[PDB]
Amino acid sequence: PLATETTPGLMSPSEKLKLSTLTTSIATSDFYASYDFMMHSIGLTSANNISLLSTGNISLQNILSEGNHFGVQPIVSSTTANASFLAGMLMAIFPKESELEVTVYFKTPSAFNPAQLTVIGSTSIGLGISDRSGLIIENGNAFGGIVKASAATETGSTYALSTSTWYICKFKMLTDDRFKVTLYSDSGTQLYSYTSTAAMFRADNATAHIGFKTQCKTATAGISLISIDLIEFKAKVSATRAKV
């Protein structure tokens, strides 16, 4: 018998799913956080553990939904160079043994522009542009890579993207601090993957974050950046504490 408001019973698939996406408050061994970008975004600097960071007067457009993409944050450049939006978390809490997995549902802009730089992975925070590691998107080209002190230390082959298209990217932290990134179509079909040779860019302080960052490299406004529907964080953690 199925559980009721007055009498106990079994748990439905819908209740199981709900529980699977519950944001961690007090941790034991698993960490989960996700945000679906449905909230009014004026002055919104975090949600469900995730930092939502605007710099350089980046233009967060009106929230919309399209098709199955519920809550979408479109992003437009400003007159300040390096303006960015970052949805991410601190690296200090996800050491290599946590095997953090980050999943991002994102839409390419309606026109590519050489000024567009997006990363799914680790990155310098804010207006910074010197360090990143994961799936990098410059203009219409996606590729796995590492950038350190503004130098490309490692670069995979490129996958050319289409404008106004929904994509999924999974970033996977490996136990030696290397990473694997996988790009999928909106139906989950694998399109591209890259596994790093060297360890990811890491800073275990607030100069860096891990997640999604989209940025305009020039000081011209009105350039569309990458829109975000959904981000998910999952990791294994050590959080066994004495109960009193």
Add this chain to the structure above:
Amino acid sequence: TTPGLMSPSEKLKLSTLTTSIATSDFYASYDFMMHSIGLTSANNISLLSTGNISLQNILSEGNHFGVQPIVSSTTANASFLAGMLMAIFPKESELEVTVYFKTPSAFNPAQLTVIGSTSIGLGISDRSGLIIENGNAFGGIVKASAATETGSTYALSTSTWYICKFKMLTDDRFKVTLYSDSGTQLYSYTSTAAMFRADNATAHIGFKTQCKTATAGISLISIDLIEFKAKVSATRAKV
């Protein structure tokens, strides 16, 4: 430590879980128990102060756990809004908003409260749902500062707890129902035309109480609890 049945309280907990990743439905609620200095949102819901509105100390009262009293400032059109964006709630979503609220000790012609859609912040040009002007609750639609539809009025009791349910219909018409704190229907209104809707940040749907005048000290409508319940089509590929 052993897998078993799900408790009725556990299922009740899950039933009011604030949506993180949407699949089939949306839910959000806020019970106003948090320290309110610099609090601009909770549980997906916007908590918007404008015109230097005076948010009084949080209190509880009987079974009304967590109550936000609100008082006017010296800025005309000052308001507090607890709400969400309409763009995420199209007519198919069939959105339902429930508000537990308390009328002030004294009514005032400067008080304007809306449960439904409304101009954001200092705006007064557009609203649809249950409109409270002075002591009078009525269903209605206002667009560009003019009434387009107005139901009969209901005289509310001062210092009294009410419940309002706003229902979005699948054709974007609405129905509003006012209950007493006992849960018995006191007043209802079903709209003829479609509600006021703006699918951008110039509007919100939820609860808004406002002072139309620049006189401070006027108590507006206090809020205990707001609830958002909707249907969503949000199936994305798992990877």
Add this chain to the structure above:
Amino acid sequence: TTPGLMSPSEKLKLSTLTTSIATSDFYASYDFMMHSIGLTSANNISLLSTGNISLQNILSEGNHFGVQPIVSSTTANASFLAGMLMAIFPKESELEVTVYFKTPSAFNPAQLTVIGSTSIGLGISDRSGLIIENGNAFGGIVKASAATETGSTYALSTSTWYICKFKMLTDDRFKVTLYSDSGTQLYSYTSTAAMFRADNATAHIGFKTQCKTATAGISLISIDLIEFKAKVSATRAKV
């Protein structure tokens, strides 16, 4: 895809779900893993910085996942407070607060930490619960800038993880218990008089660490985790 049993893992997650819409219970916890810039609340809990207090980088240590270290500024009475309003925990709620915290590498007479009720922010006039001054923990009450009641002191060790449980009694008295990181009880105090209570925004209940002097660079007490559990009167009419 098919209905069935609930796992122990699922049962555990639901047990520590942060209360949204209340019925008979309240729970909130925060584990200090978030980027702290501009962060003033999380999971119902106020996270308050005053006097330009220096929040260090979030770290984790052993099984202490998400830790917020805290350092003094040039403002006397600069503090960090993780807590909630007292109006929402009347004496009948029997609130229980649990704090996991680490002492600094060096004690200093300027260090003042409270688990329990306290003046907010730069305030230092009122507190009750487990008070830590310099290297000494003790149960006690201070009101209007004067001790009213003071338990025996217990000498803490530097760079050491501790747990404190604060328990609200039905007559508004309190019991505090101090534990080792493995959960061995080390100290307890049960008050004779009622706790410090102010049911407004001049006070909070939870954790507060403060530097009494205008000298920067003095480490205060780090916090890993805070929990709030209580009974609530929130049975209201449905629909």
